Design an enzyme around this catalytic site. Structure first.
Site, PDB file in Angstrom:
ATOM      1  N   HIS A   1     -20.841  15.978   9.239  1.00 27.33           N
ATOM      2  CA  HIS A   1     -21.613  15.750   7.729  1.00 27.33           C
ATOM      3  C   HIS A   1     -23.038  15.950   7.889  1.00 27.33           C
ATOM      4  O   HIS A   1     -23.786  15.284   8.219  1.00 27.33           O
ATOM      5  CB  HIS A   1     -21.098  14.113   7.396  1.00 27.33           C
ATOM      6  CG  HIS A   1     -21.168  14.180   5.790  1.00 27.33           C
ATOM      7  ND1 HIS A   1     -21.206  12.950   5.217  1.00 27.33           N
ATOM      8  CD2 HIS A   1     -21.403  14.985   4.843  1.00 27.33           C
ATOM      9  CE1 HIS A   1     -21.408  12.901   3.962  1.00 27.33           C
ATOM     10  NE2 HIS A   1     -21.253  14.243   3.693  1.00 27.33           N
TER      11      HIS A   1
ATOM     12  N   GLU B   1     -11.932  19.524  -1.813  1.00 31.18           N
ATOM     13  CA  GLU B   1     -12.613  18.554  -1.824  1.00 31.18           C
ATOM     14  C   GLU B   1     -12.224  17.590  -3.172  1.00 31.18           C
ATOM     15  O   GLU B   1     -12.713  16.534  -3.588  1.00 31.18           O
ATOM     16  CB  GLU B   1     -14.072  18.548  -1.753  1.00 31.18           C
ATOM     17  CG  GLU B   1     -14.889  18.854  -0.542  1.00 31.18           C
ATOM     18  CD  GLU B   1     -14.596  17.613   0.414  1.00 31.18           C
ATOM     19  OE1 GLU B   1     -14.544  16.413  -0.046  1.00 31.18           O
ATOM     20  OE2 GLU B   1     -14.363  17.584   1.685  1.00 31.18           O
TER      21      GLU B   1
ATOM     22  N   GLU C   1     -15.479  12.272  -2.523  1.00 33.88           N
ATOM     23  CA  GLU C   1     -15.295  10.863  -2.279  1.00 33.88           C
ATOM     24  C   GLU C   1     -15.469   9.967  -3.290  1.00 33.88           C
ATOM     25  O   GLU C   1     -14.817   9.176  -3.656  1.00 33.88           O
ATOM     26  CB  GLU C   1     -15.881  10.630  -0.905  1.00 33.88           C
ATOM     27  CG  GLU C   1     -17.147  10.701  -1.033  1.00 33.88           C
ATOM     28  CD  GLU C   1     -17.815  10.761   0.389  1.00 33.88           C
ATOM     29  OE1 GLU C   1     -17.422  10.988   1.236  1.00 33.88           O
ATOM     30  OE2 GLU C   1     -19.129  10.085   0.316  1.00 33.88           O
TER      31      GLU C   1
ATOM     32  N   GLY D   1      -8.115   9.751   7.423  1.00 33.71           N
ATOM     33  CA  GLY D   1      -7.686   8.704   8.297  1.00 33.71           C
ATOM     34  C   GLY D   1      -7.968   9.455   9.920  1.00 33.71           C
ATOM     35  O   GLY D   1      -9.037   9.911  10.163  1.00 33.71           O
TER      36      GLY D   1
ATOM     37  N   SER E   1     -15.640   6.312   4.981  1.00 34.62           N
ATOM     38  CA  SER E   1     -17.197   5.949   5.502  1.00 34.62           C
ATOM     39  C   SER E   1     -17.690   5.032   4.768  1.00 34.62           C
ATOM     40  O   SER E   1     -17.192   4.867   3.522  1.00 34.62           O
ATOM     41  CB  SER E   1     -17.928   7.423   5.722  1.00 34.62           C
ATOM     42  OG  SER E   1     -18.324   7.821   4.389  1.00 34.62           O
TER      43      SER E   1
ATOM     44  N   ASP F   1     -18.741  17.214  -0.582  1.00 38.58           N
ATOM     45  CA  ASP F   1     -17.889  16.067   0.149  1.00 38.58           C
ATOM     46  C   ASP F   1     -18.198  14.922  -0.375  1.00 38.58           C
ATOM     47  O   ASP F   1     -17.450  14.005  -0.680  1.00 38.58           O
ATOM     48  CB  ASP F   1     -18.426  15.946   1.836  1.00 38.58           C
ATOM     49  CG  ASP F   1     -17.501  15.406   2.689  1.00 38.58           C
ATOM     50  OD1 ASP F   1     -17.706  14.176   2.358  1.00 38.58           O
ATOM     51  OD2 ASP F   1     -16.852  15.869   3.458  1.00 38.58           O
TER      52      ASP F   1
ATOM     53  N   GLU G   1      -7.594  16.487  -0.168  1.00 37.13           N
ATOM     54  CA  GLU G   1      -7.651  15.147   0.663  1.00 37.13           C
ATOM     55  C   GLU G   1      -6.978  14.353  -0.255  1.00 37.13           C
ATOM     56  O   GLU G   1      -6.741  13.011   0.028  1.00 37.13           O
ATOM     57  CB  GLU G   1      -8.727  15.065   1.216  1.00 37.13           C
ATOM     58  CG  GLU G   1      -9.232  16.155   2.255  1.00 37.13           C
ATOM     59  CD  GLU G   1     -10.382  15.514   2.901  1.00 37.13           C
ATOM     60  OE1 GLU G   1     -10.498  14.162   3.675  1.00 37.13           O
ATOM     61  OE2 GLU G   1     -11.537  16.236   3.022  1.00 37.13           O
TER      62      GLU G   1
ATOM     63  N   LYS H   1     -25.951   5.816   8.067  1.00 39.82           N
ATOM     64  CA  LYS H   1     -27.385   5.070   8.243  1.00 39.82           C
ATOM     65  C   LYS H   1     -27.787   4.954   9.238  1.00 39.82           C
ATOM     66  O   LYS H   1     -29.139   5.503   9.345  1.00 39.82           O
ATOM     67  CB  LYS H   1     -26.520   3.709   7.784  1.00 39.82           C
ATOM     68  CG  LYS H   1     -27.737   2.533   7.525  1.00 39.82           C
ATOM     69  CD  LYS H   1     -27.133   1.211   7.263  1.00 39.82           C
ATOM     70  CE  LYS H   1     -28.119   0.373   6.663  1.00 39.82           C
ATOM     71  NZ  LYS H   1     -29.423   0.293   7.319  1.00 39.82           N
ATOM     72  N   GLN H   2     -27.007   4.862  10.593  1.00 36.07           N
ATOM     73  CA  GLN H   2     -27.924   4.978  11.939  1.00 36.07           C
ATOM     74  C   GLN H   2     -27.455   6.270  12.372  1.00 36.07           C
ATOM     75  O   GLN H   2     -26.870   6.469  13.468  1.00 36.07           O
ATOM     76  CB  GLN H   2     -27.133   3.967  12.676  1.00 36.07           C
ATOM     77  CG  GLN H   2     -27.453   2.474  12.374  1.00 36.07           C
ATOM     78  CD  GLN H   2     -26.516   1.755  11.342  1.00 36.07           C
ATOM     79  OE1 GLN H   2     -26.784   0.811  10.839  1.00 36.07           O
ATOM     80  NE2 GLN H   2     -25.392   2.542  11.075  1.00 36.07           N
TER      81      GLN H   2
END
Lengths: 470, 487, 431, 487
Positions: C75, C332, C164, C101, C357, C160, C336, C52-53
């Site tokens: 990323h 992916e 997730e 982690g 994230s 990625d 993980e 975001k930032q």
């Protein structure tokens, strides 16, 4: 004897002949045998007839004196184009030494097994074409399968020393096709490759391992409680149940029918047996190769088969052979769960036989059929009438071999048996957790074995052949 | 003899041992042999050469000789002393040796070992370069002595030349199972090998039996036998058909070298590719006809080698004052080719190919056939490849240096006898074949032109599809990387 | 959106870039690389702030960056999904360790490390030192010790994000809830059901980690394995369109846009789901005091095992069908998964959603709240043994067993897996 | 239009469909159509061919012609009827017809179906031979109508010729998902393909998208565009360098055919193998340079074919009365090569190779570059092969028959447009490259002679290790089996 006249390069050249023949190679069937008279000296003739051939059995004079033209030797042999001699190994010399003289010129002699040519070293008239067609089945499932419009895989070969007009393969393939062999699959091998491997299989794991294993497991179950009636029931129908998985997917599938902790122990026992039995398996293959085996058995042939019978005796007077059969039923899964040591003995025996053969110049494809493919079929036999039925369905040479081995194996394994842990034989081993890594590495080692890899490829072929039933 | 005491399964086991070792398997170089007393017996060519390398590698090398040699100021004695080596007698250096390397000629092996063992301490190591004494003669080495072998894949001194260039020659090592009491065979075997520089080019872990059989077959067949036979057959044909003798001898002397150079860079495939399409096809054709004719003779040699009929035969000659070896040596030295004057002018590289179509075919025929026969006798491809193609470029270099004379001088007496034994049989065998050679087969180039697409395609595949071409590509790769690590 | 400015060909180019480097490509190591006060006097910059930032950070960091300086990512989302531009003199690189982690440090301290990915942006490598920096950087994190993949910014982001919000987290959450509510709903004591789920995933994926799906399925009895197989298939069949939808929106950028929108809407949806999810029975349930045998988690989690198989395959498949490299998809859609299962066992879904994230979390929810509803009819028709109880160990059809076993170990991801794990297992042996 | 409605994933899905089918997968043959109304809209060369084929196969075939075309017995009417074919009108044939095969030019496709659907019964099938209508134009077919395709891999008429020989031409079948109601698509397509004997050579199960996208790429690049640009470029070059124009015109007219025949027998590998070594080396280098230069142009073509930029642009021209297509056609027919006189003397096969080094290289570069660019766009190697090498020989036969005129007259208009589109860009593009040719590259042989062994080895591998060569040997192997079944 004949094998021993060859040199390393020549023995190896023959020892390693075994190719799975394509379907394009049988675009004729029993054609080359069309019209020609074929004299057998039932299983096959019955099948060949439905293929369009002139089958005629030539029984002995005395027999033909007290739906084919069942005539006699001189009354059939002369105009015979192919004399398929299927008499017992012990009498081939005589039969062949009386049939040749009557055989016309350019005719072909037919053998089922190559012991006569290779071990006895028979001499066939230079103008006679010598060939061989041997289906892979200890009994009569060849004719049965033929009825279902299918057939059993078969091996064919043509003795170099006797291929006058160079038409040995043509006859071989024709003969094989007539028996339906081309439906399942035909193996282009040789007389030498067929004899050495065949002898190895039958006496080491196809029958040898099953007899010693039966007399060792049963006897053990009894020594450790277990109702002999129940025991004998497990041993008699067990081999068949575990070997059916073996037939369906090889050692791999057979091992997967067990619980992970069960399997691992089975694998463990497997490795220990191979460690103990290796020398014996080798001795057997070595004596077959050196011709020491054939030479020795033949000494018994001329000695009234003393040994061959003396062992028949003890075999029939064994606890297992003479024991009551449980009445109640046993579940399929129960034969696995309670037969860990049995599964282990199969894996070790199959692998050891395979490995020993391949180490002696025999091609894998060939070793596979003589150390695993037929194992199931022979098991079905015991699952019918104990060891008795086995030593009756198989030739005397096989039985002689089985005894030679089993009567040596059993003692060798006495100590090992005396060390079995609870769960090995009789009582089941509870499924539970196991080291992830060990389960992974063991599962891989099993399917990674040379016989499991070729067995897969071969079973895959023999399957596509059954697909074609259109 | 020893091999003969083995059964089918046992023989096959030995015959089939041949693994290309990993560069990492030699991380300790010659360390295991550091601080040990290494005594070399016999200061011949390979003897002196291996000594120089091992010395430059930091080892302790000293030569032991029969007291008579030292006393008589024999050449072996001078060679050693003039090369700054410690030279002593058997009873003077053997007793405290950790490794006795026997590099005397095969014929003398049994005698050498019979006098050296008694003096050897307990646990000492005995080394050979050829397993003849162990496999064929049946020599019995004391139970506590470890017997190993290190055989550099090279006919001459290139093992020294390569070492001075910071490189080396591919090498074969082995340890006799019946003599490895402390299980330190491979340790000593690898040390020694690295000392000679072998680990830089590639080392093969084989066996005494595999080394003896394959090595004998190669030298008496394609590595030496075929070259002599071919040189004589081709030269003579060239003269018979008109070609000037002096020019013909030049064509032969340097022909093999030129075409085998291509073989060296890219196996049979590349050698054949140097030829023009129509020439290639003819070569292919000729080689196939040649393999049909020579298959029985090739087989007889391999069979006789496997059966001990060959060693037995040559040992008969040993005990006969080398009559057959010497009479054949003298005769081969009186051949037209060996005495023919050498062409003054020059011959271009491509001329040797174009004007040597048959020579290329003989190479192809001999290579595949030797390889094939060996693999059919239980020998593994890797071994067969090294004894039926790898060293061919090297032997050819010898002929390009001093005719056949040089080849037979460079190679061992066993290889010389073996060559002759085959040569004096192969030349007559091909007499009729040569009598039907068409124009262009040898001496004159075959005009370039069109060729049937299907046939060129099929022939190109038949070539590179051969088992030896496959293995060759792989094995040459490995060696190319080892060499690639020249930084 | 950058990825959107590329054409089919240019896209397939990036999407299919992923090569497992070798031990040799890391000889130099970190040797090459050996507030407003440090920003200027900096060789390389490492922006690791949330997505975001991200744009903002760079929009203040570039001005201070010297000439020829290098900017590093973890990323490529800001580069691919966000049309973020950078000075042509700035060399943009990336180094993203395959771990959620902090095992990226726990493993480094042990000597080994975490298999990490590295890439360099095309239009941002003037001095042509992208790989030099990336390799040196990654080497400094211990990556070369486990294995480093050479991919691309586009290949990294696209896969990625799919991982997730699909099998790595989305399937795990939806699976937990669906399974917990089903157990309780069928009687099972909520305190027990709670432990099964919390620790089940971890136990199961442990086998998955050691020998891929094959080993996971091998821990079950034959009859249970066959059932897990069937349930797995049925499952893929149903979740198919959903995984595809997710993969498709990640390609087209309908996703990156949708979430970048919620960035302006003050993470509304992101927080509404973060909260709604905490009110779940499972998140707020009592934990069994007693114990559950390792093997119990398997025998009582058949449908759990099936969800993993189905989810891993379907995720893997869908990625390859979108132009992603096999090995790339493996890391992916399976590699993980175990690491994240640990997180759930540590503190339910709370822990997971906290470790991953904000982008990861947002994605998870987007899938969960959709998947959960989807499987209701499925769950409703479950059978005894499928979840909670244990399918008794017995005989099964030789043929069917054999065919399923081969079906299981013949899947593409199982093939690549066995290979890739082997690689990493030997990269670790080198120590 | 349509293809553009799909997304990355969806595109690659269809784009990657093309598997070689098993012989026995066509046991039923065309028995699924035996006993059904098979109508063929529009009659032309292509049409009559298939009809005559399915005819002998045993299928009721009819030809639906336009209203006027029947009144003034136009070409289509003549061709059909003359063969004893049942002809009629749309209103009396389309209705109660099971399969309506639309074999009309792309330009009129839309309009053809925009009148045939209404008359088509329910459950009826609409076949094709190219999906330009479906894929490139948003052609909407009745939800109940099954849309299939059967496109033979031959530009000419060998589809009929090979059929009469008892063999056939490998054909590519497909079925539009959006139109497979009764899920009978594959059942029909399979039958249709068998009715044309396509199962005798090999039937590729692909998709409407893979076909169009690849079919278009190959034709405008290597398949046609390269041949025309190559012919013009080389002819002008040969003449500019002193070759007698009449002889140059013959070298070009018959060279492509000759060189390309070897290609047909053994892929790029065999083609290069016909040159002398030094010549092969040079052709190889020229091939690399040529691929570096033409890469962007091949890429642009493929890219516009995907983006729809091509179909969009050509369809524009359709409305503009084929301005560009005709202007280019006219210009082409005025080229020196098209009007030059043909040398009367004979030219040997090998000469076409030797004097056509650059032509060979252009084929290598074009073939690989086209294949490479297609695969890099989601097209399967299997599908890329057939459209960038398999048919090249056939197009070459065209030129050999009547210069470029025949080529352009045989291929469809869409193909011709694509060709010109590429040609008129390629020709100026290679002008500076042609100005740098060295002696031997074109029109004069490069004498055989020595070449670096390693280099020749390397080039040889590089050649036969290329992707298209691999799939090529594989596919050509399959098609050869179907062929070997001449029983």
């Amino acid at each position: 004897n004949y094998f021993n006249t060859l040199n390393l390069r020549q023995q190896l050249a023959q020892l390693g002949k075994c190719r799975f023949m394509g379907r394009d190679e049988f675009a004729d069937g029993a054609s080359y045998l069309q019209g020609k008279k074929v004299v057998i000296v039932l299983n096959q003739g019955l099948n060949m007839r439905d293929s369009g051939l002139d089958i005629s059995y030539a029984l002995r004079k005395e027999a033909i004196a007290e739906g084919f033209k069942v005539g006699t030797y001189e009354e059939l042999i002369p105009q015979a184009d192919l004399v398929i001699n299927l008499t017992p190994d012990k009498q081939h010399s005589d039969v062949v030494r009386t049939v040749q003289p009557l055989m016309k010129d350019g005719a072909a002699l037919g053998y089922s097994h190559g012991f006569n040519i290779v071990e006895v070293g028979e001499q066939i008239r230079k103008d006679i074409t010598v060939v061989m067609v041997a289906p892979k089945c200890p009994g009569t499932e060849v004719r049965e399968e033929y009825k279902r419009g299918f057939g059993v895989p078969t091996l064919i070969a043509v003795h170099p020393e006797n291929d006058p007009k160079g038409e040995g393969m043509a006859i071989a393939k024709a003969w094989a096709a007539a028996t339906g062999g081309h439906r399942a699959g035909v193996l282009e091998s040789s007389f030498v490759a067929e004899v050495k491997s065949d002898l190895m299989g039958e006496q080491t794991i196809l029958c040898g391992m099953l007899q010693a294993g039966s007399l060792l497991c049963f006897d053990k179950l009894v020594e450790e409680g277990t109702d002999p009636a129940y025991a004998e029931k497990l041993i008699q129908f067990g081999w068949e149940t575990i070997t059916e998985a073996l037939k369906q997917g090889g050692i791999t599938l057979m091992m997967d029918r067990l619980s992970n902790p069960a399997k691992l122990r089975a694998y463990a026992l497997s490795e220990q047996l191979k460690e103990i039995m290796a020398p014996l398996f080798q001795k057997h293959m070595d004596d077959i190769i050196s011709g020491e085996f054939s030479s020795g058995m033949m000494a018994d042939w001329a000695n009234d088969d003393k040994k061959l019978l003396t062992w028949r005796e003890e075999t029939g007077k064994t606890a297992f052979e003479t024991a009551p059969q449980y009445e109640g039923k046993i579940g399929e899964q129960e034969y696995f769960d309670k037969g860990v040591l049995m599964i282990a003995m199969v894996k070790a025996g199959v692998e050891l036989a395979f490995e020993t053969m391949v180490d002696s110049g025999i091609i894998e494809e060939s070793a596979y059929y003589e150390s695993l493919h037929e194992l199931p079929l022979i098991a079905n036999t015991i699952a019918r009438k104990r060891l008795y039925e086995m030593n009756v369905v198989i030739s005397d040479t096989a039985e002689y071999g089985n005894y030679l081995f089993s009567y040596a194996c059993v003692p060798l394994l006495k100590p090992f048996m005396a060390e079995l842990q609870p769960g090995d034989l009789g009582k089941a081993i509870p499924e539970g957790a196991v080291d992830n890594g060990q389960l992974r590495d063991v599962n891989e080692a099993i399917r990674s074995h040379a016989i499991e890899q070729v067995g897969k490829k071969l079973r895959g072929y023999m399957t596509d052949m059954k697909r074609i039933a259109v």
